[PDB]
């Protein structure tokens, strides 16, 4: 079955950088939309990025455009979130999330355990 595991969270300075990794098991990346969703206690979850293999587009939340960048290592089946210019409001648990690429949902059906990012 689809399984995801995030890593790389921690405490980072204001305006700093951090690179999260999501390792996968059970599928090839090109069959799925994949990306990142975050949730801070007290707020509903917020999509951060989502990648579609139908045309290779990555969608980003307006709040992170230009600061956060998604990438994949297709051979290693691992995806990444490169965060730059971190702000205190970026503090949240970050999940990598995926859906089978059939047009009905996107970065929704499966998620990992999450990794905490805390910005001072």
Numbering used by the authors: 1 to 120
Give sentences copied directly from the paper behind this entry.
In this study, we present a comprehensive investigation involving the systematic humanization, experimental validation, and computational analysis of two llama‐derived VHHs, previously identified for their binding to NKp30 and their potential for natural killer (NK) cell redirection (Boje et al., 2024; Klausz et al., 2022). These VHHs, designated as VHH1 and VHH2 in accordance with our prior research, exhibit atypical Hallmark signatures (VEHG and FARS), with VHH1 additionally featuring a non‐canonical disulfide bond. During this process, we successfully determined the co‐crystal structure of VHH2 bound to NKp30 and obtained the apo structure of VHH1. Interestingly, our findings suggest distinct mechanisms underlying antigen binding and conformational stabilization in VHH1 and VHH2, determined by specific residues.
